[PDB]
């Protein structure tokens, strides 16, 4: 079927803050991509093969709030710009791509999927250039192949004059090596 | 929750309408030049491209607009009035083959529905089923470019 996505806000500003400090989240989890926040910035996190991966430039070395209190990161790789925690209970995991396709689809924090043409192991180009403002908050989001499998996690926008024309991502391979580290 | 696809009806038949770029498009052979109902009275068609079997009214309430495709994929998906998804391989400008033919009844009442690409973006509007002995094996469709041209 075609890739479709929807977004749902499960928590607000004040509840987010209290939860950040407390580190205890009793809310139920659903979905394969979680919208995530710290008191400083908001980004995305993607569950692949049972691990909730996200961008290090967003999560830093922080723990993730869970119903059992904060959870310590399973993987941290400042270089790869990755962090991973055990996937929250209730989440659904994506599976790594096994077809090396060059036609990728980026899911933004607004639940939109945009086509991206793979131009390297970690780069791809937007078929329809969007302003980086639209991409703000999407670091850590998934880059899916036509089969709905994870190819990479969005990391940075390649833009000029404020218009994103390409994107840099973390290919799934970096995940396997980072876990091995 | 807002829908991109509206299930519509006239006294004669029932079909589908698809919201793309703020317009609620459907097939002329279903809507004709009929006006669409709203809580404030009938609203007239913004476009009536009889030649392309295309009509459009301003997007109604409870709907959200679909985005046109830009990946040029040939791997299309047809959404029926029953919410069924059907893989269709694009054969040309406005033709495609069902990866698995179904009785025309399975595609019955879905005209006006959308033809989507691997990213869920609008590729075209389902115009007519191409039958062979009551089995739909291909479909005719109005490319999004035509909708974009009509407006």
């Amino acid at each position: 079927a075609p890739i479709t996505a929807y977004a749902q806000q499960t928590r607000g500003l004040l509840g987010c803050i209290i939860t950040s400090l407390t580190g205890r989240d009793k809310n139920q989890v659903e979905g394969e991509v979680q919208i995530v926040s710290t008191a400083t910035q908001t980004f995305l996190a993607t569950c692949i093969n049972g691990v909730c991966w996200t961008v290090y430039h967003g999560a830093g070395t922080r723990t993730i709030a869970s119903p059992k209190g904060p959870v310590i990161q399973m993987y941290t790789n400042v270089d790869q710009d990755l962090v991973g925690w055990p996937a929250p209970q209730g989440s659904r995991s994506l599976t790594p791509c096994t077809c090396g396709s060059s036609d990728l689809y980026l899911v933004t924090r607004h639940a939109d999927v945009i086509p991206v043409r793979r131009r390297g192991d970690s780069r791809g180009s937007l078929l329809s250039p969007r302003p980086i403002s639209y991409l703000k908050g999407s670091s850590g989001g998934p880059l899916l192949c036509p089969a709905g499998h994870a190819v990479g996690l969005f990391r940075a926008a390649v833009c000029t004059r404020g218009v994103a024309k390409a994107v840099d991502f973390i290919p799934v391979e970096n995940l396997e090596t980072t876990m091995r580290s | 929750v807002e829908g991109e696809v509206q299930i519509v009806s006239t006294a004669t038949q029932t079909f589908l309408a698809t919201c793309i770029n703020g317009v609620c498009w459907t097939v002329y052979h279903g809507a004709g030049t009929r006006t669409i109902a709203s809580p404030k009275g009938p609203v007239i068609q913004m476009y009536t491209n009889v030649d392309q079997d295309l009509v459009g009214w301003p997007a109604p309430q409870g709907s959200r607009s679909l985005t046109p495709c830009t990946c040029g994929s040939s791997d299309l998906y047809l959404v029926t009035r029953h919410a069924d998804v059907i893989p269709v391989r694009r054969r040309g400008d406005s033709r495609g083959s069902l990866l698995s033919p179904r009785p025309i009844s399975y595609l019955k009442g879905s005209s006006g529905g959308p033809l989507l690409c691997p990213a869920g973006h609008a590729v075209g509007l389902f115009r007519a089923a191409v039958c062979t002995r009551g089995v739909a094996k291909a479909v005719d469709f109005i490319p999004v470019e035509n909708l974009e041209t009509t407006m």
Partner: peptide, 16 residues
């Protein structure tokens, strides 16, 4: 007559 809306489909399968 008018074309009336009798139902709606959400492509993402979004609840509520």
């Amino acid at each position: 007559g008018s074309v009336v809306i009798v139902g709606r489909i959400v492509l993402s399968g979004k609840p509520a």
